[PDB]
């Protein structure tokens, strides 16, 4: 890997973030990127719940 790294850098001037399978006849997904979105989406959802816990009013916008 290191020799390939040197060759690329002299030309210009992380393969473990991808889950890759083998063609029985290839990159299959993005664990780190997917988990960040899947974890953040529930994180803003949790923030909504803690805000909603002790409220009886709320803004009613009919526009």
């Amino acid at each position: 890997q290191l020799k390939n790294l040197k060759a690329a850098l002299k030309a210009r001037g992380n393969p473990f973030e991808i889950k890759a399978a083998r063609n029985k006849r290839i990159a299959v997904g993005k664990p780190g990127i997917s988990k960040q979105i899947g974890e953040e989406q529930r994180k803003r959802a949790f923030e909504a719940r803690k805000m909603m816990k002790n409220k009886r009013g709320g803004v009613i916008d009919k526009r």
Partner: protein
């Protein structure tokens, strides 16, 4: 309900970037914690 122990940390992209920068800084300063041969 209560939980007895913290869940195992998830390796999201941001955590890797936090790890990545720490490694980059240490190499740049060239400070590593490695065994040093004794004299004599």
């Amino acid at each position: 309900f209560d939980r007895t122990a913290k869940p195992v940390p998830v390796i999201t992209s941001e955590v890797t970037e936090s790890l990545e920068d720490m490694i980059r800084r240490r190499i740049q300063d060239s400070n590593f914690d490695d065994l040093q041969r004794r004299t004599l």
